[PDB]
Amino acid sequence: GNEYQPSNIKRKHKHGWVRRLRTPTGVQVILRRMHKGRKSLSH
């Protein structure tokens, strides 16, 4: 079949911006993303 089973709630909760803010490492992720000049910090 496949390893992918799309869900919006799980994606927005887990990979969301607020989740990135709740942890320092996530802040570092957003940090390196903005350092790389990503147009989107979240998919």
Partner RNA sequence: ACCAAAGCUAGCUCAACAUAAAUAAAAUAAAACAUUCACCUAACAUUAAAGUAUAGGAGAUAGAAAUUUUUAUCCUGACGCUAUAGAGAUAGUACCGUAAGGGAAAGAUGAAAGAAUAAAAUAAAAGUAAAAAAAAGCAAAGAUUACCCCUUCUACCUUUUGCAUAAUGGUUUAACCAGAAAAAAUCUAACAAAGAGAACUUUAGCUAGAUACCCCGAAACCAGACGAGCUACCCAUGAGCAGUUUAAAAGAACCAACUCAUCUAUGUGGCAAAAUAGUGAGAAGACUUGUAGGUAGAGGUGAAAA
Partner RNA sequence: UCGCACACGCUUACAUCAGUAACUAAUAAUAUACUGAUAAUUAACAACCAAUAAACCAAAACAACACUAAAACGUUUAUUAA
Task: Give the interface with RNA as residue ranges (CB under 7 A).
Answer: 3-11, 13-15, 23, 25-26, 29, 32-33, 36-43
In the complex, minimum distance from the CB of residue 30 to RNA, in angstroms, rounded to a whole number: 8
Q: How far is the CB of 43 from RNA (least distance, A)?
A: 3
Question: Which residue, 18 or 32, is less far from RNA as judged by CB?
Answer: 32
Question: Other CB atoms closer than 10 Å to residue 11's CB: what's the count?
Answer: 12
Q: Exposure pattern of 22-42 as b/e (b: 16+ CB <10 Å)?
A: eeeebeeeeeeeeeeeeeeee
Least distance between RNA and beta carbon 16 (Å): 10
